[PDB]
């Protein structure tokens with residue numbers, strides 16, 4: 334584990350991360366997909382062998398020795414707010430178990446269900462709070478990746494508020 338476990342946020346492509354493993358915002362069928370998923374497919378295509386897994390779960394596949402944790406958040410266009418919220422919290426809990434099992438000192442993570450699976454809604458606070466709920470008990474350095482300038486500022490404010 335990290336000597337002083339921390340949270341940080343960076344606004345850039347998660348495929349260029351400087352962490353010991355990456356979390357993919359995966360689809361249930363292990364397809365190349367869009368957004369973060371398509372960038373992860375271009376960088377670590379080997380990690381998509383048998384990566385299909387149900388909504389609310391995480392499945393790790395190695396690309397060489399580099400772990401790619403495929404986490405499947407719900408698509409809020411299909412789920413109700415109540416059941417989608419429950420599946421989103423569950424996907425993050427499974428990411429925390431995988432990060433712990435791997436023994437890594439750092440992990441690059443995107444905000445699950447905030448892109449095309451958001452159902453056209455702003456889910457920054459909802460997704461980030463479920464990320465914190467799951468990762469707070471781990472000792473890995475967590476680096477959150479985003480692409481929007483205003484989202485970078487809001488995630489940074491939320492991290493600093495708790496310190």
Ligand SMILES: Cc1c[nH]c2ncc(C(=O)OCCn3ccccc3=O)cc12
Nearest residue numbers: 368447448449451454455456480481484
């Ligand atoms: C590739 C890229 C560049 N700039 C981006 N900015 C945003 C996204 C993206 O997926 O946004 C989803 C989350 N989000 C972010 C800001 C405002 C509303 C909202 O729902 C992708 C890119």
Ligand SMILES: [Cl-]
Nearest residue numbers: 344345346349
């Ligand atoms: Cl970039």
Ligand SMILES: [Cl-]
Nearest residue numbers: 447448449450
């Ligand atoms: Cl998404």
Ligand SMILES: [Cl-]
Nearest residue numbers: 479480481484
């Ligand atoms: Cl973003």
